[PDB]
Amino acid sequence: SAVDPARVDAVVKTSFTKLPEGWESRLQQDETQRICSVTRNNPSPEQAAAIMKAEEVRIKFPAGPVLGSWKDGAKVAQNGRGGQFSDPPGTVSGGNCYACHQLDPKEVSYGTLGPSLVGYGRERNFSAEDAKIAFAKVYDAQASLACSSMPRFGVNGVLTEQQIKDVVAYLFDPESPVNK
Amino acid sequence: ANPGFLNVDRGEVLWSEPRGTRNVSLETCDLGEGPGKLEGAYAHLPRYFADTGKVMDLEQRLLWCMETIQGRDTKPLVAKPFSGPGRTSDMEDLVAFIANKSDGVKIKVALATPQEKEMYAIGEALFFRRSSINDFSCSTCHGAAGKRIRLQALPQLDVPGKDAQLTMATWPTYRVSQSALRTMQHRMWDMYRQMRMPAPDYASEAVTALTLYLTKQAEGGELKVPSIK
Numbered sequence: 001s002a003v004d005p006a007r008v009d010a011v012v013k014t015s016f017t018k019l020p021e022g023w024e025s026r027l028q029q030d031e032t033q034r035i036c037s038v039t040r041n042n043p044s045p046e047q048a049a050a051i052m053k054a055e056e057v058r059i060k061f062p063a064g065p066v067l068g069s070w071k072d073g074a075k076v077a078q079n080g081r082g083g084q085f086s087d088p089p090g091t092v093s094g095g096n097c098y099a100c101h102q103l104d105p106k107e108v109s110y111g112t113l114g115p116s117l118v119g120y121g122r123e124r125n126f127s128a129e130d131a132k133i134a135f136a137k138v139y140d141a142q143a144s145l146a147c148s149s150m151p152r153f154g155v156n157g158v159l160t161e162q163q164i165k166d167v168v169a170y171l172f173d174p175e176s177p178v179n180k
Numbered sequence: 181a182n183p184g185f186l187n188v189d190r191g192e193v194l195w196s197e198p199r200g201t202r203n204v205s206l207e208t209c210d211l212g213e214g215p216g217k218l219e220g221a222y223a224h225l226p227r228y229f230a231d232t233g234k235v236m237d238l239e240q241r242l243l244w245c246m247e248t249i250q251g252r253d254t255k256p257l258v259a260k261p262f263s264g265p266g267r268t269s270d271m272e273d274l275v276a277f278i279a280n281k282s283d284g285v286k287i288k289v290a291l292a293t294p295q296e297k298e299m300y301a302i303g304e305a306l307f308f309r310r311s312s313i314n315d316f317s318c319s320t321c322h323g324a325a326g327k328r329i330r331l332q333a334l335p336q337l338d339v340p341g342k343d344a345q346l347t348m349a350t351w352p353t354y355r356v357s358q359s360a361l362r363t364m365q366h367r368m369w370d371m372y373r374q375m376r377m378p379a380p381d382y383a384s385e386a387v388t389a390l391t392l393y394l395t396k397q398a399e400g401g402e403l404k405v406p407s408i409k
């Protein structure tokens with residue numbers, strides 16, 4: 001095979017010299033970043049399985065319930081700023097679901113890289129349990145699907161427990177435009 | 181017919197214009213297709229240059245010329261490679277012009293040495309490489325067909341074929357939403373920026389590694405440069 005060497009590290013190490021304070025870490029892959037890259041996001045069955053084992057343990061669930069605030073969850077969904085070097089200090093991060101998902105059926109700007117989430121809660125009978133599944137999906141998706149293209153929001157420090165509570169509510173709160 | 185024809189004619193100036201301690205122009209700068217010869221040189225870039233011993237894009241090449249031929253102080257340019265309101269980029273204008281000397285030509289990079297095949301590989305790797313707080317890779321958003329981010333459709337770049345050809349045929353380009361002509365460098369910067377990565381080094385190895393991959397997946401693409409977007 002065209003065995004691609006560890007010459008990829010240097011090329012990054014040496015080509016990424018302007019670093020905001022404490023960003024050397026953003027270059028080093030974690031073990032589930034590394035497998036997904038070396039196999040072009042096509043894990044083998046065994047590959048996928050090990051990831052899941054390491055990812056689903058990293059999931060912390062809230063002390064209280066899953067549901068939060070759908071009105072404030074809508075704000076997490078639309079915000080596409082956060083985490084960037086171009087981003088001024090204090091910039092509140094979002095999940096930006098709209099970039100990849102259809103959410104509010106009424107809304108006309110949405111991506112198709114991810115699944116339609118229109119009526120998600122209603123389609124799942126508003127089940128409190130299936131919302132736990134949607135929580136752990138936002139907190140860490142690679143816990144349920146290895147090498148998935150959805151960001152591991154909650155395990156990577158982009159989303160706070162409360163933001164996930166809020167964005168899940170947007171999928172699950174019967175009174176949300178997503179569920180209407 | 182296109183506001184990006186300023187940069188075209190601003191790049192024509194700087195190519196003609198003697199500069200540096202040696203105070204000569206870049207009219208004798210070799211871009212791969214022989215000294216001075218501008219025809220098709222971008223359609224065959226990035227490539228290996230014997231005078232350095234590496235693979236090189238258009239900008240890394242221009243900059244080399246500025247150093248040795250002209251003797252121009254490049255340090256202010258690697259610092260402000262991307263133009264602003266009320267301030268040009270002599271690195272985006274010389275790309276417009278040189279790119280236009282490859283207009284109507286077909287994209288045709290070739291893996292011909294140990295250096296270029298190695299580079300392409302590493303660019304393929306960097307294309308797939310997941311890293312940082314959003315876990316993104318270029319292949320996350322360029323890893324299939326018929327996909328769109330919000331309303332903007334995504335070009336497939338993980339395979340040879342249409343999208344890629346058309347893409348590298350539409351770069352460098354003019355974006356009205358900024359009202360500025362932009363080069364592959366800036367796009368590379370913008371995408372790593374929005375991947376939550378650190379800001380890549382202008383004219384670095386990684387950027388040029390990616391470009392070769394993108395350009396090799398773009399083989400056959402008939403340059404129509406610089407475009408309107």
Ligand code: HEC
Nearest residue numbers: 095096097100113114115134138141145148149150151167
């Ligand atoms: C960078 C792309 C991306 C972004 C951003 C993103 N998603 Fe996803 N999402 C995907 C993809 C691709 C899948 C399918 C693979 C999977 O199961 O992980 C998915 C799956 C899901 C699913 C399960 C889909 C199903 O089949 O039932 C849910 C629910 C979901 N995402 C919610 C969210 C929420 C909430 C956000 C905002 C916090 C978000 N997504 C942001 C790409 C994305």
Ligand code: HEC
Nearest residue numbers: 316317318321329332335347350367368371372374375390
């Ligand atoms: C945020 C998701 C996202 C990621 C991550 C991403 N892309 Fe893009 N890409 C897009 C979108 C959306 C556009 C359309 C913007 C435009 O071209 O004006 C685009 C456009 C492009 C274009 C120009 C397309 C054209 O014809 O105008 C190139 C080249 C490109 N991407 C390559 C890359 C590379 C290389 C990377 C890795 C540094 C990358 N992309 C990462 C979503 C993404």
